[PDB]
């Protein structure tokens, strides 16, 4: 599971693929909780961005800033010609508000967010394209 800051209209086609089915987990996740008697207080909530392992954590009093991101990434998706399905944002106010928070992104912790992306591709980029082509390298 991973969570990126970036702007969805920039994400390479895989990483746009990734997060779209990664996000709804997230909402999965703190669902499980809420039913095992588990509440926002119990968790230990990173006060910054952060990528390992707090990582999914971080993201537990913000899941309205997830549900505007769903939101995002499904028209990205579709504004490509991808055929998805479940194009339909997840319906949260089941959740306690506590839960439901809002988050904006410094500069500098959207960039911690882009260098794991740019890392990524560096790996081996003839995995990655953008639009369908390969305009990395």
Known sequence: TRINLTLVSELADQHLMAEYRDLPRVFGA????VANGKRVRDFKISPTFILGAGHVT?????????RKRQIELI????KRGFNIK??????????????RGDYIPHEASIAISQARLDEKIAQRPTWYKYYGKAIYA
């Open 86 to 99: 479940d194009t339909t944002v997840q319906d949260i106010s089941d959740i306690p508000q506590e839960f």
């Open 75 to 78: 028209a990205e998706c579709l």
């Open 30 to 33: 703190v669902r499980k909780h």
């Open 58 to 66: 971080f993201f537990y009093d913000k899941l309205e800033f997830l």
